[PDB]
Symmetry: D3
Subunit: 247 residues, 6 copies
């Protein structure tokens, strides 16, 4: 399906493309994204659309306003039965598997705090953070929920073994410069410079030969793909069991 169709399918995702550089901006009515079942499932479907559309040369992922995503509407999720958890398991797999199936480089521009699926931006090939960006996993273990949704794969992968486990268990908040030092972020920029820097990088990548661009991505995500396939759905099933047990 062509850009003109899918670019307007998503209430929580603005999609704008210029010169084959796709800017994907998550949002709730134009304010910082409030995480919902709807935003979750839209991102999974949107990632699929982006991946299937060859005219996307490079992807920039960002939020809007003061936060990337640090608010949630728990009333929007059904977390009580195996029935409802299989819906979450199935689209949770597609969320991260569709992200990794995108075959062009992905740049994150983290504009502010993220506490819901904070692993998504740090799965990108280039990670840029505003001075105010932070990363934190409060909705999992600090809230009595298994970090089994990809968090358990990605954070030890990107922070290393012990920083990753500690981050996940203690609710540590990583600010922009700590994330930079831990190697999860590549550049810290003022808020005003963040998106211009993403576009500059993206344009440079977009100028490279078609197949060079596409294959850079493919050769660079091999190990992440292997560990996601190994551990993601095991995490999700365990997180589901633990969550159902609360009732």
């Amino acid at each position: 399906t062509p850009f003109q169709e899918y670019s307007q399918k998503y209430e929580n995702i603005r999609l704008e493309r210029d010169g084959g550089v796709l800017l994907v901006t998550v949002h709730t009515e134009g304010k910082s994204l409030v995480w919902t079942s709807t935003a979750h499932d839209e991102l999974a479907y949107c990632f699929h659309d982006i991946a299937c559309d060859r005219e996307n040369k490079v992807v920039i992922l960002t939020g809007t306003g003061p936060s990337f995503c640090n608010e949630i509407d728990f009333t929007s999720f059904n977390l009580g039965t195996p029935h409802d958890w299989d819906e979450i398991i199935f689209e949770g797999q597609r969320l991260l598997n569709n992200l990794l199936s995108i075959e062009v480089p992905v740049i994150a521009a983290v504009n502010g705090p993220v506490t819901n699926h904070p692993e998504i931006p740090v799965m990108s090939d280039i990670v840029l953070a505003a001075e105010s960006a932070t990363f934190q996993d409060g909705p999992h273990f600090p809230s009595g929920i298994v970090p089994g949704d990809g968090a358990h794969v990605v954070w030890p992968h990107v922070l290393g073994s012990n920083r990753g486990r500690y981050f996940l268990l203690t609710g540590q908040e990583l600010d922009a410069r700590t994330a930079l030092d831990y190697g999860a972020v590549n550049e810290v920029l003022s808020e005003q410079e963040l998106l211009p820097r993403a576009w500059e990088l993206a344009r440079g990548i977009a100028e490279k030969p078609l197949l060079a661009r596409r294959y850079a991505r493919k050769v660079l995500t091999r190990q992440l793909r292997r560990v996601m396939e190994a551990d993601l759905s095991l995490g999700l099933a365990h997180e589901a069991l633990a969550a159902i047990d609360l009732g």
Copy 2:
């Protein structure tokens, strides 16, 4: 299945005290800093098995006592000369680290001071706390003419990264507390006085979480270490044994 009342008292080098589901494991020799021996080695393998099988452990703290975690060894306690003798070390060495990984609750290390004997054990924990005086060093392997094949070869490159881990194992580098912190092997550096109180504080917090959340967090976090340990540990041990036997 062995009850806490029995196993808590069966280990001469491991004090085992539980309060509100938090198990404090203190390694020691006659109430001073642990002297590494064949007996301590095997006791820890069996003890980790017992801990793993006891579901009333909600969270574990591993610590030492006195000025050192474990930086002295009694080499005369080990039979290192024949394959027969190495097979018992290989078998219990696999059990030492696999039984540790079979523990299905979060594990916190509180490293009270220098560790040179199996220093990989504390850094395999989910949370790593260190005293200011804590140090890590693999002197008993390559600096002493012995292959670091007992798990040191899996864990140090896993936790420090490829180049730091290989260098650490080949040069006898001593990591002080703040270098280990910067390298990401340690999470917090505390004064000696603050170390255990902080370990307790983190442990009590974890222990409050729901039963399956606590358990499955540990399970979902240790996948990659378990894969690499299964892939590489036995290979390391057999090679270390071959090389050691050659020495005589």
Copy 3:
């Protein structure tokens, strides 16, 4: 029978090989100045690593360069990059370059005397990495040049720098200076130019004085994961690099 040191030490116009008390010093050069990367040098290193690996009298290896750069110049006219024919020779010898490097069964110490832009992954594949204050690492010949980083750069850099530092390094043409490489953990020690080789020799002598099987098996037990990821991903990388590059013509 194996090729004896007396033979292979004199086989390679771009690789000097000096053995002193079992410590083998491998110095890459172009007529006694800093190595200029060529097809010849590429293939020589692949064959040389095999000869080194098969010679058990090498107790420890030090890899270094000469002059102000380790290798940051190239002779573009020495390669043929236009046809699948051209590329199968690069694929085949490129696989042999890194696999033969990894087949060396003693510890390898790198002493990075200056900038490296051509196969900079080679030094950082070493068990001990020492760098002069002036050393740098950069991957300009790949992506900043419109070429896929699939010749092993895609394996080694994310492995040694970590996932995000590695991918960023490969996509943006980032130059790592010595102290940044040290902080990122790709380098173990930064030394003055005058102290670099002396330190390499010091560490190398210390390893060479360990018992025979101990040193031989240390390398083997320490390179398992790198060997696993190289076997999984190297050829995939090279074939994709080859396709992308042929497409340009």
Copy 4:
């Protein structure tokens, strides 16, 4: 929102899609005759497998052909095989074809109604494989035709036949008849032409009666190793296939 069945069931000129009691019958064809493999059919199957995977009202899938052959003719003129960027369309969609198939999370039954020589690995990736007496399996369009079997053939056939039978099948153009495929363990049941689809329906109805999550998670727990090796090896094979094919002009 997912594409509804009422829409996607009519979108594919080479794939008939009929559903009853949650059993989805997927019949591949060309103008109602036995399927002729083309670029169109190849990509349609990739898209269709994605649509089937995303529609959770598919409780079980039966995959089958029509007429004397499952698919034993190919129109090579429908593909562009001469340049890298044309091969990237095939690499991309080729990956989707097999990965989308594996992303289907209900059990898949193949009903092989006669000879298959093009993508014969598709039906044998199924969880249950039924064959008519006249079914055969052969990989002639790859190696016997001077083309690398790198499109998934190299993964699936060694995986389902075993190492040596798989390699031999792919290098010699061996044709497996139904009873041989049965004995090799690629086929589970050989039926007369009249009993084939009735048996597929019998088995599908049985599966469809099982509880929702049991049915879904059965597929998932059973395809782990196949998924591992496809991820590890598919793209490698495709790039190598492309390089070799391009060199051919």
Copy 5:
């Protein structure tokens, strides 16, 4: 724990040793084993005791009476909640991982039908079967239960991809000669010849040098151990979720 402690510990497992060959006979009051949660957990602990006892040179695993194990006391299991299923998951992991931790060769002598954990005998290094032996997975998919307890790992591993998946979906019964042809079984014997043959092969193994016996087992179980670590707990969590959904 030496043999004289654990040899009498298990109500459903008789243990006898002759020339260091351990014969493990599963039974219920001296009749064919009736599967229960007790028998399940006793096997798991027993396999640990066997693995840790270096005076076991070789192991023979068999049943008694007409069946190896084709009856069950469905009332003995608690399959209603996640925390009840964590019991089964934890111990199901131990059952198969403790089996694989045994570091001497294991011979199965399948005396008749097995339908409850039939994967156990075929995990052995040598599999001998009486003419009357059969193998079938009725209790999983034919009963609306996910075959995720290790069935999913072992049967595709031993039968091959397609025979394995088919066996697990259709409730196919493999008779002894089919199991032989499929490679799950090495020898089919008359009932009267089965145990003598097991003893003969075990004694032949026992004659080899200590470390040769032990290391033969260790180098031969590498691949099974790898797939079991990759996939077992994934299967058990999903089986648990699907089973809880049943009420």
Copy 6:
């Protein structure tokens, strides 16, 4: 830099090497009679597989023996098996033997002319396995002689026979005749004594007619999983075999 066929073809006393139209016939022998396994022969085969792999004019390989047996005699006095020193040489060359074989990048055909009891895994690692009616396979020199089968036997036999058949074969000293090996899928064709070499040549000539890159890449995509398990498990096996053997003293 690669040794040309003119040099290496005459370098091995136990390996006759002849090439016609790019088909390389590798015949193992002791003084023109059936090969007797020795340290010399083991080390020669390792060196020879490296020469074969590096020589691109080899389009396809036939591996065979001479006389009534492929290799069913051994000279145990030619091996040093007492010390860790002795065994590290065996480990090192045992790794090179199987890894050099797998480094060969063209299809390999085995023509097994009779019984093989020494390193029987070698022929069954081939892409096509042909057996005379008199061929047999057996691993008597390992476990039936009180030695761990840790030299690659432990990898290859479960890989090619399946899990239970592989383990049984290695523990019991089972002898597989030609028809059982065929049924088990280790062998692809059983031929009469007179038809074995004619058939191998016929298949080799057909493969050699294929396009250059397709031939070369066919091998590479077909040996992925064997390479992965060999890397995972070979050295572990050898070290444990060494430990057990040394203990025998």
